[PDB]
Write a protein that binds this ligand. Structure first.
Ligand SMILES: OC[C@H]1O[C@@H](O)[C@H](O)[C@@H](O)[C@@H]1O
Ligand SMILES: N[C@@H](CCC(=O)O)C(=O)O
Length: 351
């Protein structure tokens, strides 16, 4: 009695069809007897019909800047219906690829933020935030904050609880991130929080004390930045580690040949700020470690203590510096996120 009906997720003649979602077709009062989608070159798009014959959907990534033609026929006891629909997908001016840290499957410390760094400036930060889905278990409140025009961070109010699972789905493919810039692809990463490791460098004592789940496990004499190039106070996130590295002040904005410049090969170096602070082996200053500050800002320790730090501290662990004559590490350093007050971080800066 009733003629079958076709309903597609696109309209014939549409332009700017976004490719963040599959294209589908549904039949009512009948079943789908044939569904094909081809691009402007005639090549078919992969799809799948549901077992009950009522719903077809694309099953592969749809492309930017394509003209697709969908042909569908529904058949029912009451007759047949055929439709042909042609539509154009989004045509980006630019593409941007996101890069996520930390790495997939990593175990990181209680200070590790989620980091999503785009390779282009993001004109619509809110669109980017909306496209990033963070799952936590146990669930905890967190929020986004932009360090610069390309990199956004997500973290909770307080250091993570050990044993928390964190899942990051950056679903930017087909999403307009402003001014015609679209996501180059999706990215999906997962990590876990390990032991709580917090090392405190107190300028009053010139000791760097490492605590693991609240217990003191190591007490390292240190020499921090001299009064003219002091170590900033505050909370530092542990970054990369190196068995050896050439520390080149030009990497951190300071000409080597300038008064505060340097180019030094050091062993057992753990990065704790993008501004170039490391914990590292300093055989030349062992006499001053635990007594006086001599460095350009780095936390000088002994060879054995630097190796110990390399072996026992991981990305996302915390170093807190207190009581120096320096200022406070900038919240937007790169590893300084925890120095931003929570009310300010939570409010964000997407606008
Ligand atoms: O996503 C984590 C972010 O926190 C920063 O401390 C480090 O650069 C990486 O671990 C990353 O950029
Ligand atoms: N490092 C160089 C200058 C580097 C730079 O300007 O980036 C020098 O002092 O010799």
């Amino acid at each position: 009695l009733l003629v079958p009906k076709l309903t597609a997720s696109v309209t014939d003649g549409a332009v700017g069809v976004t490719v963040d979602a599959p294209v589908s077709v549904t039949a009512a009062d009948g079943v789908l007897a044939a569904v094909t989608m081809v691009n402007d070159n005639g090549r078919p798009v992969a799809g799948r019909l549901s077992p009950d014959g009522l719903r077809w959907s694309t099953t592969e990534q749809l492309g930017y800047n394509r003209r697709y033609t969908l042909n569908a026929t529904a058949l029912g006891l009451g007759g047949a219906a055929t439709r042909q629909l042609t539509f154009q997908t989004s045509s980006p001016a630019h593409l941007t690829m996101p890069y996520v840290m930390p790495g997939d499957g990593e175990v990181v410390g209680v200070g590790e933020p989620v980091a999503i760094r785009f390779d282009e400036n993001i004109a619509d930060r809110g669109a980017a935030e909306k496209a990033i889905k963070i799952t936590t278990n146990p669930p905890v409140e967190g929020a986004f904050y932009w360090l610069n025009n390309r990199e956004v961070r997500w973290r909770p109010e307080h250091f993570w609880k050990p044993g928390t699972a964190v899942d990051v789905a950056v679903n930017t493919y087909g999403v307009d991130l402003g001014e015609g810039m679209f996501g180059e692809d999706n990215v999906q990463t997962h990590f876990t929080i390990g032991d709580e490791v917090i090392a405190t460098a107190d300028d009053n004592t010139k000791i760097l004390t490492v605590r693991v789940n609240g217990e003191v496990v190591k007490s390292m004499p240190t020499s921090m930045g001299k009064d003219s190039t002091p170590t900033a106070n505050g909370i530092y996130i542990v970054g990369s580690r190196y068995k050896h590295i050439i520390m080149d002040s030009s990497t951190y904005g300071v000409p080597v040949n300038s008064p505060n410049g340097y180019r030094t090969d050091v062993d057992w170096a753990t990065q704790i700020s993008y501004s170039g602070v490391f914990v590292h082996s300093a055989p030349w200053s062992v006499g001053a470690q635990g007594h006086t500050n001599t460095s350009h800002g780095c936390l000088n320790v002994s060879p054995s203590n630097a190796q110990w730090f390399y072996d026992h501290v991981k990305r996302g662990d915390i170093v807190e510096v207190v009581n120096t004559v320096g200022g406070t590490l900038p919240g937007i350093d790169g590893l300084g996120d925890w120095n931003i007050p929570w009310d300010q971080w939570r409010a964000g800066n997407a606008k």
